[PDB]
């Protein structure tokens, strides 16, 4: 009402943050940034609740204000900066590098990566257009604008970003036999090797997707992120690599390693 909201109560936050329902009435509202606040992770909850490197927002602020943490090469000393999918986070102290990817339960994992892998990121192009004076440009999933792309780069493709400059090194197209990451919905976190896509001109192009264990499913085209061709991926996959074990085999593995 009357303007934008600036608070976010607990029990209204997205559940994949794993914020406890006790310990405060409010949740850290992500500031405006490159991602939607639903599919984002504030640096406060990432540093405190996933890494345990801090206990308070005061300690997170004390870490941020001395320019220790940087994300996508930029320092970003904001407590509620929305870190989203495949954003890289570099901590020069501890020489740590994380890449924000979903685990198969649908939450963000602490996926430690090396420096040569932290030197880039992939972006799913959302629209290709002609800017002013006829300059073509793309818009990635994190709102990055990249001018003068390759003319073969159409929508729903993946571009590899230099992450020091904003240039494109190469790009992956979108058709059958491509390794994808599911980012959104019930199947959020699986990796499943497109077999074919159905059009349905008028809304919500569907795509059929089968994992390494031949368990197929289907997803809207909004939630799919192609990350290479079948076999080799262009990034380091987290543990499990998006299989979505059933609860039976999950407790069998928990009884195996114990």
Exactly one of 10, 16, 29, 144 binds Mg ion (CB under 5 A); that residue is 29
Q: Which residue, 168 or 227, has its beta carbon nearer to RNA?
A: 168
DSSP per-residue letters across 15-56: GGG---SSS-SB--PPPSSSS-STT-EEHHHIIIIIS-S-SS
Q: Binding to Mg ion by residue 80, rule CB under 5 A?
A: yes
Q: Which residue, 79 or 219, has its beta carbon nearer to Mg ion?
A: 79
CB of 103 to Mg ion, least distance (A): 25
Residue 56's alpha-carbon distances to 8, 76, 80, 190, in angstroms, are 18, 18, 13, 33
Asked whether 241 and 191 are in contact (CB, 8 A), the reply is yes
Q: Binding to Mg ion by residue 10, rule CB under 5 A?
A: no
Asked whether 98 and 110 are in contact (CB, 8 A), the reply is yes
Q: With CB cut-offs between 5 and 8 Å by kind, which of Mg ion, RNA, none does residue 217 bind?
A: RNA
CB of 109 to RNA, least distance (A): 9
Q: What is the DSSP letter of 232?
A: S
What does the alpha-carbon distance between residue 258 and residue 255 come to, in Å, rounded to a whole number? 6
Q: Which residue, 25 or 232, has its beta carbon nearer to RNA?
A: 25
Q: Binding to Mg ion by residue 90, rule CB under 5 A?
A: no
* Chain Cα centroid distance, residue 44: 17
Q: Which residue, 186 or 212, has its beta carbon nearer to RNA?
A: 186
Helix (H) / strand (E) element for 66: namely none
Q: With CB cut-offs between 5 and 8 Å by kind, which of RNA, Mg ion, none does residue 231 bind?
A: none
CB of 235 to RNA, least distance (A): 19
Q: What is the CA radius of gyration of the chain?
A: 19
Q: Which residue, 36 or 58, has its beta carbon nearer to RNA?
A: 36
CB of 184 to RNA, least distance (A): 5
DSSP per-residue letters across 121-160: EEEE--EEEE-GGG-EEEE-TT--EEES--TT--TT-EEE
For the record, the structure tokens of 29 come out as 């509202």
Q: With CB cut-offs between 5 and 8 Å by kind, which of Mg ion, RNA, none does residue 131 bind?
A: RNA
For the record, the structure tokens of 36 come out as 């939607």
Q: With CB cut-offs between 5 and 8 Å by kind, which of RNA, Mg ion, none does residue 80 bind?
A: Mg ion
CB of 61 to RNA, least distance (A): 14
Q: With CB cut-offs between 5 and 8 Å by kind, which of RNA, Mg ion, none does residue 255 bind?
A: none
Q: With CB cut-offs between 5 and 8 Å by kind, which of RNA, Mg ion, none does residue 133 bind?
A: RNA
Residues that bind Mg ion (CB under 5 A): 29, 80
């Amino acid at each position: 009402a009357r303007g934008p909201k600036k608070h976010l109560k607990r029990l209204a936050a997205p559940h994949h943050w794993l914020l406890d329902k006790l310990s405060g009435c409010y949740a850290p509202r992500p500031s405006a940034g490159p991602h939607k606040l639903r599919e984002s992770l504030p640096l406060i909850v990432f540093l405190r609740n996933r890494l345990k490197y801090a206990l308070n927002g005061r300690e997170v602020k004390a870490i941020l204000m001395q320019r220790h943490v940087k994300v996508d090469g930029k320092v970003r000393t904001d407590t509620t900066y929305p870190a989203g999918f495949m954003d890289v986070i570099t901590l020069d102290a501890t020489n740590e590098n994380f890449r924000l990817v979903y685990d198969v339960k649908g939450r963000f994992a602490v996926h430690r990566i090396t420096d040569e892998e932290a030197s880039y990121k992939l972006g799913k192009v959302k629209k290709v257009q002609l800017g002013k004076k006829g300059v073509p440009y793309v818009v990635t999933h994190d709102g990055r604008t990249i001018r003068y792309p390759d003319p073969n780069i159409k929508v729903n493709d993946t571009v590899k970003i230099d992450l020091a400059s904003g240039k494109i090194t190469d790009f992956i197209k979108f058709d059958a036999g491509k390794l994808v990451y599911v980012t959104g919905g019930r199947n959020l976190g699986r990796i499943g090797t497109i077999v074919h896509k159905e059009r349905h001109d008028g809304g919500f192009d569907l795509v059929h997707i089968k994992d390494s264990l031949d368990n197929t499913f289907v997803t809207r085209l909004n939630n799919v992120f192609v990350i290479g061709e079948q076999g080799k991926p262009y990034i380091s996959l987290p543990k499990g690599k998006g299989i979505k074990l059933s609860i039976a085999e999950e407790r069998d593995r928990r009884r195996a390693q114990q």
